[PDB]
Amino acid sequence: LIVNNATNVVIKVCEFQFCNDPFLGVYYHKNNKSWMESEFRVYSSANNCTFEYVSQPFLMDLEGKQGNFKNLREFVFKNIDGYFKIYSKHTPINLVRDLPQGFSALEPLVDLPIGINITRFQTLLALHRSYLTPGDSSSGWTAGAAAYYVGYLQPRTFLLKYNENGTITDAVDCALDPLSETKCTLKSFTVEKGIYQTSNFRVQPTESIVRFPNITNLCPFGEVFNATRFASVYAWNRKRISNCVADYSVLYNSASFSTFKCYGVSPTKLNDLCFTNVYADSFVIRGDEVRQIAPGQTGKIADYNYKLPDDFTGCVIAWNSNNLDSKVGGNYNYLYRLFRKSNLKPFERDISTEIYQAGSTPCNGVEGFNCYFPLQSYGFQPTNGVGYQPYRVVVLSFELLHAPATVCGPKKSTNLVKNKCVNFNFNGLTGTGVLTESNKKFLPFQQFGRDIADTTDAVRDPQTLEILDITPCSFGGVSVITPGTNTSNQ
Amino acid sequence: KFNGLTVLPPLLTDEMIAQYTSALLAGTITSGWTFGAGAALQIPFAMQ
Amino acid sequence: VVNQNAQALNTLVKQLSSNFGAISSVLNDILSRLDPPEAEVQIDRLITG
Numbered sequence: 001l002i003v004n005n006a007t008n009v010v011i012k013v014c015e016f017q018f019c020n021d022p023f024l025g026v027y028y029h030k031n032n033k034s035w036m037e038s039e040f041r042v043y044s045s046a047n048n049c050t051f052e053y054v055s056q057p058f059l060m061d062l063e064g065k066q067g068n069f070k071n072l073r074e075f076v077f078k079n080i081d082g083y084f085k086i087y088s089k090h091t092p093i094n095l096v097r098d099l100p101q102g103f104s105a106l107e108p109l110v111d112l113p114i115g116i117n118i119t120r121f122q123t124l125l126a127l128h129r130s131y132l133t134p135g136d137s138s139s140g141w142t143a144g145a146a147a148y149y150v151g152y153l154q155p156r157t158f159l160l161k162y163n164e165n166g167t168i169t170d171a172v173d174c175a176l177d178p179l180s181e182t183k184c185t186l187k188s189f190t191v192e193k194g195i196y197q198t199s200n201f202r203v204q205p206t207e208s209i210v211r212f213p214n215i216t217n218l219c220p221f222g223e224v225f226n227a228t229r230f231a232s233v234y235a236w237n238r239k240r241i242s243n244c245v246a247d248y249s250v251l252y253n254s255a256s257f258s259t260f261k262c263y264g265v266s267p268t269k270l271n272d273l274c275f276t277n278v279y280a281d282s283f284v285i286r287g288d289e290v291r292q293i294a295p296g297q298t299g300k301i302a303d304y305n306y307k308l309p310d311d312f313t314g315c316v317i318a319w320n321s322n323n324l325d326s327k328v329g330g331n332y333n334y335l336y337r338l339f340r341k342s343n344l345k346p347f348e349r350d351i352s353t354e355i356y357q358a359g360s361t362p363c364n365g366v367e368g369f370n371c372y373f374p375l376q377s378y379g380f381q382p383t384n385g386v387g388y389q390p391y392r393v394v395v396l397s398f399e400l401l402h403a404p405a406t407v408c409g410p411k412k413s414t415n416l417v418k419n420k421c422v423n424f425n426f427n428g429l430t431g432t433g434v435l436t437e438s439n440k441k442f443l444p445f446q447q448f449g450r451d452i453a454d455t456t457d458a459v460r461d462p463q464t465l466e467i468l469d470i471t472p473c474s475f476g477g478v479s480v481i482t483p484g485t486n487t488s489n490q
Numbered sequence: 491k492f493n494g495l496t497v498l499p500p501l502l503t504d505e506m507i508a509q510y511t512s513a514l515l516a517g518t519i520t521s522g523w524t525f526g527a528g529a530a531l532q533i534p535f536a537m538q
Numbered sequence: 539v540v541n542q543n544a545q546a547l548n549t550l551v552k553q554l555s556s557n558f559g560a561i562s563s564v565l566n567d568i569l570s571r572l573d574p575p576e577a578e579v580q581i582d583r584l585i586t587g
C-alpha cells in the first residue's frame with residue numbers, strides 16, 4: 001500500500017484482507033466549514049508486515065474546490081529486480097477533459113527494495129459527505145470531479161536529446177514510422193534530401209513439421225543396465241543397439257546413478273536428436289578407477305585396459321555395484337591387465353595372457369624373477385573402502401547426422417504442408433524454408449541433395465519417398481526516399 | 491542471392507548509354523568539334 | 539573484371555564450410571546437442587572466423 005493521509009506518507013508491505021471497495025471518507029460539517037478525515041476503510045486485517053515506512057507529518061487542504069483542474073500529475077511505476085521504482089512530476093495546467101500535448105521530463109523520486117510479485121493493482125480515492133449526502137455509508141455520499149488515464153509500457157528503443165543544462169527536451173521513437181527509423185539511423189533530428197538504407201524485412205515462418213519413420217521397439221537396456229552379471233574390465237563387453245526409442249527420462253524409476261555425464265551432447269536434448277549406430281560398452285571397475293574413464297587420462301585402466309578417442313561424443317554412466325559384486329571371502333571373478341609392452345588404442349580390446357618380461361632374461365613362459373603375469377584378480381568384499389568398492393560402468397557412443405539412422409528417441413510426427421515459409425525436421429536434419437515439389441531424380445540409395453553453397457536444397461521425405469525442394473524466404477532490403485525534413489514529412 | 495549477398499542494378503539502362511553514344515556520333519559527323527564548345531554549328535563533311 | 543568479381547564472390551561464399559576450430563560448421567548443428575554455457579565458446583570461434 002502507498003497512501004498519503006492527511007498528515008504523513010505511509011508505505012506498507014503486509015498481508016491485508018482488503019475490503020471489496022476500500023476508500024476514504026471525509027465529512028464536511030456545515031456548522032464549521034471544514035473537511036476532516038473520518039472514514040478509512042482499507043483492509044479487514046493485517047497479519048504479517050515485512051517492510052514499513054512513514055514520511056514526515058504535513059498538512060494539505062482537503063477542501064472541495066469548484067474551479068478547473070490546475071494540478072496535473074504524471075507517475076510511472078516499475079518493478080525490476082526486486083526494486084519498485086516511482087518516477088514522478090507535476091505541472092499547473094488549465095485543461096479539464098482534454099489531455100495536453102507537451103514534452104516534460106520525469107525525475108526519479110523513490111526506489112525501494114521490495115522484492116515482491118505484483119500482477120494487479122487498484123487506485124484509491126476519497127469521498128465527500130455532508131448534510132447534502134443523506135444516507136448510509138453505501139449511499140450517503142457524493143463523488144466530486146477528478147480524472148485520470150492509464151497506459152502500459154513496452155520494451156522499445158528511443159533517441160533522446162540532452163540540452164546544455166542537462167534536461168531531456170525531445171525524443172524520437174525509433175520504431176514508429178519509417179522517417180523515424182531514418183532519423184534514428186543517422187543520429188540527427190534533421191535529414192536532408194535523398195535515399196537511405198534502414199533495415200531488412202524478413203518473412204517469418206509460422207508452422208513447424210516433423211517427419212519421422214515408424215519405430216515401435218523399445219531398447220534392450222534391461223540386458224544392459226539390469227544385466228545379472230558383468231564382465232572383467234580388460235575384456236570389456238560391447239553391444240550394438242538399433243531400431244528402438246531411447247527414453248532416457250525413464251532412467252530414474254528403476255535405479256539411480258553415481259555418475260551420469262555426457263560429452264559433446266547436453267542430456268536434455270537426447271530426446272530430440274536422432275542418433276546413429278548406438279554402441280553400448282559394459283564393464284566393472286574399482287571406484288578409484290572411475291576417474292580414468294575420460295578422454296586424455298592416465299592409469300592402468302586408462303592405459304592397458306581401456307581407451308577413448310579424443311573426439312568421443314557420448315555419455316558415461318556408472319553406478320556403484322558393491323552389494324551385487326561383494327563377497328565376504330572376496331569377489332575374485334574380476335581381473336585386469338597391469339603390464340603391457342605398449343599403450344592401447346581407443347576402442348581396442350586385447351586378451352593376450354603372456355608372461356611379461358620386466359627386464360632382460362626372456363621368460364620363455366617361466367614367470368620367474370622380472371617375469372610377471374599381466375592379469376591380476378580384483379578382490380571385492382563387503383568390508384572395504386568406498387574408493388575400493390566395485391562399480392558397474394556403461395559407455396554410450398554414437399554418430400549424429402552423418403548417415404541414415406534409426407534411433408530417434410521419443411517424439412511425435414505430424415502432417416506435411418507446402419508453399420509456406422515454415423520450419424522442418426527431417427530425420428534430425430533441421431531448417432526453415434518453403435517446400436515445393438522437386439523435378440530432380442534421386443537414385444534409390446541416397447537421401448539428400450547439395451549445392452555449391454554447401455547447404456541442402458532437396459530432401460527425400462522419410463515417409464512418402466518423395467523429393468522436396470527447399471526454397472529460402474525472400475529477405476530483400478529496405479530503402480527509403482525523402483525530400484528533406486524542412487520541406488515535408490512525407 | 492541466398493546468403494545475404496545482393497547485387498544491385500546500375501543507374502543507367504543500356505539503351506540510355508546507346509542513346510548517349512549515338513548523340514556523340516551525330517555531333518561529330520555533322521558539326522566537327524564545334525558542338526563541344528557551344529551551339530552545334532553544321533558544316534559539310536568534306537571540309538571537316 | 540568479371541572473372542575477378544566472380545572469383546571473389548565464390549571464395550567469400552565457399553568460406554562458410556570450415557570449422558575454424560569448432561566441432562562443426564553449421565550453427566544449426568550447435569543450436570541442438572548443446573546447452574548455452576559450453577556452446578558459446580564454439581559459437582565464439584565461428585564468429586571470429
Ligand SMILES: *[C@@H]1O[C@H](CO)[C@@H](O)[C@H](O)[C@H]1NC(C)=O
Pocket residue numbers: 005006007008010037054
Ligand atoms: C497518518 O499516518 C501516520 C502513520 O500511521 C499516523 O501517525 C498519522 O496519525 C496519520 N494521520 C491521519 C490524519 O490519519
Ligand SMILES: *[C@@H]1O[C@H](CO)[C@@H](O)[C@H](O)[C@H]1NC(C)=O
Pocket residue numbers: 047048049
Ligand atoms: C505469519 O502469520 C502467521 C499467523 O499469524 C504466523 O504464525 C507466522 O509466524 C507469521 N510469519 C511471519 C514471518 O511473520
Ligand SMILES: *[C@@H]1O[C@H](CO)[C@@H](O)[C@H](O)[C@H]1NC(C)=O
Pocket residue numbers: 117118119
Ligand atoms: C505473480 O503472481 C501471478 C498471479 O498469481 C502469477 O501468474 C505469476 O507467475 C507470479 N510471478 C511470480 C514471479 O511469482
Ligand SMILES: *[C@@H]1O[C@H](CO)[C@@H](O)[C@H](O)[C@H]1NC(C)=O
Pocket residue numbers: 163164165
Ligand atoms: C539553463 O538554466 C538557466 C536558469 O534557469 C536558464 O536561464 C537557461 O535558459 C537554461 N538553458 C538551457 C539550455 O536550458
Ligand SMILES: *[C@@H]1O[C@H](CO)[C@@H](O)[C@H](O)[C@H]1NC(C)=O
Pocket residue numbers: 221222223224225226254
Ligand atoms: C530394471 O528392472 C526394473 C525392475 O527390476 C524395471 O522396472 C526397469 O524397467 C529395468 N530398467 C533397466 C534400465 O533395465
Ligand SMILES: *[C@@H]1O[C@H](CO)[C@@H](O)[C@H](O)[C@H]1NC(C)=O
Pocket residue numbers: 212213214462463464
Ligand atoms: C509407416 O506407417 C505408415 C502407416 O501408418 C505407412 O504408410 C508407412 O509406409 C510406414 N513407413 C514409413 C517410413 O512411413
